[PDB]
């Protein structure tokens, strides 16, 4: 068998085989059983006005702000919605998705999204503060800011103008709390614009994108960081398939055959092997303050949590979503958390902490 | 710059003593250099870009009293330069948030976008 | 999909609103000559954009066995619907043969459609 590992080097993972110690008729899913699926709706059934969005309480949902137009190229939002509709989530564990943007661009794209359960559309503007208050942006689980005008503007100064303005607009709102704690992900084009997303960081134009603060906290994502995937795919051809299972929610090549033929996710009837497809794991986060291992955060060791969670619940643990000022002397109010990947066995464990983990589907 | 230096360094004010530092990426022509030589003690020029924070560090924007952003009021696309000047406000507030920025907007909705900036 | 078509002719067209007219009457008219019996005629189905066919249909509209499927030649579903395995000829034309200025991918659509049917 092939083992996919995470280590600092290649001669370290050479010890992975150098070891001996010697010498019921309703269509609830797709035709493959990998995603959820519903009846093909009409676009008026999901369009909400601002009063209608104000009435519907939305918590733990996902708000996708889009700066689109009639002329801009298609983003391909099915690749965003499909990992949020994977069948290793229960139907109550799904997240509602509301698109805030121009209705013309969403009209161009809706014929690929129209077979998904919990999708809504508010035809407004991401910069308008009224529409963001209507969709309860303080209660969302993530706000995603994309732009389809990432290829046709020729100014090379304000390509990321709309996304930066929308990020700061959400970062300055106030509710009856402030909107600096809302989790936002914004996609950038020129990586030099990453300095404008935060205020308290020490910006520098010569620092790379991976070392900047709003990338390390997971609030920015430019496509330039995927340039390493070519050499990664060449040296081990199973890596890209490992990613596409991990990332697109288990896209087996059977769905690739289906979209080669019909180019449309079609629903299926429930078989027991369709239900056997649902046994994919799920990536999630874990709060270190109330759960079964909440006692371990007393400055303990991370590897004790790793062995205990894997023995009890069969759950892997990549790493730590450590708060930025959890290692500082004075207690601050900065709720920004950065990412530690694969900490050692003796790594200290702050109680206010989050754990990246792979959860099974029981 | 000529209209600015007329209305700023006018003798009808009191004995003002602030110095005027300019910052533009385009190098000045010979007429601007003659104008800066006419104001040799009051006006200094420094070529740089306001978006690049090293150039903001060069003009001592952390100790400046205020920062002024003139606009090209006869531009071909008013939303384009309103976007550019909004980006300039974002850049200066990204370096130093406790500065006083005076700017010019060409529409009112682009003025409304400036209040959404957290500084 | 319901209408069985065998021994027919499938004319795939990469057209648009802006592209120049091909002049499909000169393709249909030799397939409607009177030295064929009416049972010996071949059915003709146009697979392409309905806008371009709307621009051209006023010359074709007096012929017996012409059909139109408003789809895409690259879509494999539409080619399965018209029973492309049973046709007597599949003809791939493009009206965008004069307005593209790349000189590298003028025949991009026709080559992709040919390999799509070939696989
Ligand atoms: Ca390494
Ligand atoms: Ca910053
Ligand atoms: Mg001086």
UniProtKB/Swiss-Prot annotation, chain A:
Region described as Segment S10: spans on this chain: 215-235
Signal sequence extent: none
Binding site for Ca(2+): 195, 198, 201, 203
Documented effect of changing residue 23 to S: Loss of heme-induced channel inhibition
Disulfide bond annotation, renumbered to this chain: none
Source domain of life: Eukaryota
Post-translational modification: Phosphorylated. Phosphorylation by kinases such as PKA and/or PKG. In smooth muscles, phosphorylation affects its activity.
Location(s) in or outside the cell: Cell membrane
Region described as Heme-binding motif: 20-23
RCK N-terminal domain location: 59-176
Tissues where this protein is expressed: Widely expressed. Except in myocytes, it is almost ubiquitously expressed.
Region (Segment S9): 57-77
Motif Calcium bowl positions after renumbering to this chain: 186-208
Miscellaneous comment: The protein was initially thought to contain two functionally distinct parts: The core channel (from the N-terminus to the S9 segment) that mediates the channel activity, and the cytoplasmic tail (from the S9 segment to the C-terminus) that mediates the calcium sensing. The situation is however more complex, since the core channel also contains binding sites for Ca(2+) and Mg(2+).
Assembly, per entry: Homotetramer; which constitutes the calcium-activated potassium channel. Interacts with RAB11B. Interacts with beta subunits KCNMB1, KCNMB2, KCNMB3 and KCNMB4. Interacts with gamma subunits LRRC26, LRRC38, LRRC52 and LRRC55. Beta and gamma subunits are accessory, and modulate its activity.
Function: Potassium channel activated by both membrane depolarization or increase in cytosolic Ca(2+) that mediates export of K(+). It is also activated by the concentration of cytosolic Mg(2+). Its activation dampens the excitatory events that elevate the cytosolic Ca(2+) concentration and/or depolarize the cell membrane. It therefore contributes to repolarization of the membrane potential.
Entry domain remark: The S0 segment is essential for the modulation by the accessory beta subunits KCNMB1, KCNMB2, KCNMB3 and KCNMB4. The S4 segment, which is characterized by a series of positively charged amino acids at every third position, is part of the voltage-sensor.
Family statement drawn from the similarity comment of this UniProt entry: Belongs to the potassium channel family. Calcium-activated (TC 1.A.1.3) subfamily. KCa1.1/KCNMA1 sub-subfamily.
Protein name: Calcium-activated potassium channel subunit alpha-1
Swiss-Prot record, chain B:
Binding site for Mg(2+): 19, 42, 44
Record note on modification: Phosphorylated. Phosphorylation by kinases such as PKA and/or PKG. In smooth muscles, phosphorylation affects its activity.
Disulfide bridges in this chain: none
Tissue: Widely expressed. Except in myocytes, it is almost ubiquitously expressed.
Cellular location(s): Cell membrane
Every RCK N-terminal domain range: 1-119
Highest taxon listed in the record's lineage: Eukaryota
Task of the protein: Potassium channel activated by both membrane depolarization or increase in cytosolic Ca(2+) that mediates export of K(+). It is also activated by the concentration of cytosolic Mg(2+). Its activation dampens the excitatory events that elevate the cytosolic Ca(2+) concentration and/or depolarize the cell membrane. It therefore contributes to repolarization of the membrane potential.
Reported disease: Paroxysmal non-kinesigenic dyskinesia 3 with or without generalized epilepsy: An autosomal dominant neurologic disorder characterized by absence seizures, generalized tonic-clonic seizures, paroxysmal nonkinesigenic dyskinesia and involuntary dystonic or choreiform movements. Onset is usually in childhood. Patients may have seizures only, dyskinesia only, or both.
Assembly with partners or alone: Homotetramer; which constitutes the calcium-activated potassium channel. Interacts with RAB11B. Interacts with beta subunits KCNMB1, KCNMB2, KCNMB3 and KCNMB4. Interacts with gamma subunits LRRC26, LRRC38, LRRC52 and LRRC55. Beta and gamma subunits are accessory, and modulate its activity.
Family in the record: Belongs to the potassium channel family. Calcium-activated (TC 1.A.1.3) subfamily. KCa1.1/KCNMA1 sub-subfamily.
Note: The protein was initially thought to contain two functionally distinct parts: The core channel (from the N-terminus to the S9 segment) that mediates the channel activity, and the cytoplasmic tail (from the S9 segment to the C-terminus) that mediates the calcium sensing. The situation is however more complex, since the core channel also contains binding sites for Ca(2+) and Mg(2+).
Domain notes for this protein: The S0 segment is essential for the modulation by the accessory beta subunits KCNMB1, KCNMB2, KCNMB3 and KCNMB4.
Protein name as catalogued: Calcium-activated potassium channel subunit alpha-1
Organism of origin: Homo sapiens (Human)
Organism classification: Eukaryota, Metazoa, Chordata, Craniata, Vertebrata
Residues of the full protein shown: 421 to 539 of 1236
